[PDB]
Symmetry: C3
Amino acid sequence: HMMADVETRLAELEKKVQQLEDVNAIRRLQWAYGYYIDYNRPEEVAGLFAKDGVVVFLSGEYVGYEGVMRLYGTWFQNRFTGGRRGPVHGLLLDHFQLQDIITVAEDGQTAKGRFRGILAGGWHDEVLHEKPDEVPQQFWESGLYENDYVKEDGVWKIKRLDYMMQWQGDYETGWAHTVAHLQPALVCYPENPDGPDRILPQKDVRQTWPHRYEVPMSFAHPVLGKAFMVENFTPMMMKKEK
Amino acid sequence: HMMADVETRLAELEKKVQQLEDVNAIRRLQWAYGYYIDYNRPEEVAGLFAKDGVVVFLSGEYVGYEGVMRLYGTWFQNRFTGGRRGPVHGLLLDHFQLQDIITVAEDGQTAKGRFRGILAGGWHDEVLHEKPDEVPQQFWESGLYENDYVKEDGVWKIKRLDYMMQWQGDYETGWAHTVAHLQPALVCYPENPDGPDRILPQKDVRQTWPHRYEVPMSFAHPVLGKAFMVENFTPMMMKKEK
Amino acid sequence: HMMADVETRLAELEKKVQQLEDVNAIRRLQWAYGYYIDYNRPEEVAGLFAKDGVVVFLSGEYVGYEGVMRLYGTWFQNRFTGGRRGPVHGLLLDHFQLQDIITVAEDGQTAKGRFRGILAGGWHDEVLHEKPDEVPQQFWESGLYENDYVKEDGVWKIKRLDYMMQWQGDYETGWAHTVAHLQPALVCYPENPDGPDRILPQKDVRQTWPHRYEVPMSFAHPVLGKAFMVENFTPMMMKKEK
Ligand SMILES: COc1cc([C@@H](O)[C@H](CO)c2ccc(O)c(OC)c2)ccc1O
Ligand SMILES: COc1cc([C@@H](O)[C@H](CO)c2ccc(O)c(OC)c2)ccc1O
Ligand SMILES: COc1cc([C@@H](O)[C@H](CO)c2ccc(O)c(OC)c2)ccc1O
């Protein structure tokens, strides 16, 4: 009666506190990922993943440490630094990370997270001779993440990092006058040395900016939850004919 | 003596843990609000509010689900998507949300929150024929929020969302060469179908960029609190005559 | 046996909860710092510091309330507002603050924090006559913070704020065509009225954009920790010869 209560409260607290630590830990993975990719440090990125982890980029799946090192190292690091750990003279790749919404499973062994990034990228004039031809000298980019996390032996890791690029703009023209200089993946590893292990099913392939596709929310409506229905609200607005 | 202590500690913890959950929940409302308005989904936004909730935009009060659906649906959704739930081809409305400072009431039934947003907005050339005339093709905007929250039947909701736009810049000219294309609200609903239920008192009406007005901090100085006084520090600097 | 357990759990919880409060409190210092510097309010900034606190700007150390008021007041406030507490007509100085990674000491009396800022800055045409000559009318800037915190009489304060500017871009040309208009500090107070008390050792002086230098991470690899080694991952990528 007296003790059963004290027990109850300590179980209810340990559960709530673990959850609060879990949210901190999972956000911490995404922010750390950001600081590493800003420095073209593919080794630190690879280490964030479970050994069966997957990263998705331009609708291509890169599998395990090897696939992550292939995306961030073989492709990105050679593209931006010619294969040096950054940062390096004149090379900007700032992926500002924000707006985390993390949903931890009730059992505390898996989670989802929505995040986004805005990238300021480019070669200063002093290092412009190092830039490849198929890339603007300076650009903006933004993307959404809907990631999966696994608590593996009590340690939060990235199960699935799914970066969906939403738009790019050349600094000089902006998003309104710029077509994405990246297209859905076509050729897999090993045919393509920069390529993914697998391409997503045909239906799920994202065409790039200006094309848009909904990235569905991993998180439930945070007030109405499962009780939220669009059609309970739509009738209150008026649709106009132009 | 022994048990009274154990009780004390469990009361002191349950209080601290609830607070930590409350901060997470309130930030979660603002970040969720962001993802919905990026998609021109006024129904999800309306659902975040208490039924006597208020949103303030350009010094106009929109009251309840109806008023929120009138701002985000009748006005914004028709303006940006011609009345479709987004996202849609070529239409960018990314309101990057950050820098939350949340102050929960001691009793845990109300809160305040300061937040801000920076908006990258526009129509790609491919959908430029859908853009209304009174709006730049592509622009930056930023604003501050000082919001009120109500824990209504143990559930955090928006009592008052007060977006105060601070500046806009056409992508091509930037903030320094751009006058706000939005002005303080003048005409109320029902006269104006896009209009607010009420306009703020005359004294409180904000003129727009380049005009600036302080948005006072909802949060106390986080080191000195109520002990903070400006005039204890001012004498240490030197004012210069130009 | 029964009670020793209950004790154990309450000690283990009080420790975990204090940590969660500490992370909130330390982030809160950086976000509050942001809102104050956006308003050219050097008094609120000074109050965030321990009395032996230090701020580092362009490789110069400003010591104590006086040194902070000298940086943010005597220098910055006169430069941007001619010595008025902001905000003021036509003057933009929005330092968007994000991507906090906080590491609290095991004993809970000191912490480190990595953060970053992106600054949208400038004078509208209407106040362009107030701008000094050595500054672009409108610009972007970004920087990294690796700060130290001290829990002084149970109250979190800034021990060391170390802003390392990473890049600037004139709005009209962007980061790729812009050299930093700020250089490493050369002349100390009192010779220089805007100058720092001390300049960092010669070795540690940062040259500015386009020059880049690593800002080492205050935080351990958040999955592998001390077990993380670069050379365990590098062999998995391929270095390419161009
Ligand atoms: C897969 O995770 C991410 C990928 C990106 C991309 O936007 C990268 C930047 O690192 C990229 C941008 C422009 C390019 O032209 C490019 O060429 C291959 C690559 C950003 C953030 C991620 O999390
Ligand atoms: C009221 O909440 C918000 C309002 C805004 C506005 O800046 C919106 C964007 O949704 C807006 C921008 C430019 C326009 O020309 C416009 O025409 C009506 C509307 C942003 C964030 C908010 O939280
Ligand atoms: C030391 O803390 C910070 C310093 C800055 C600087 O970028 C400031 C803006 O306040 C600055 C920018 C441009 C200038 O030309 C300038 O002249 C002295 C100063 C930003 C954030 C900080 O935390």
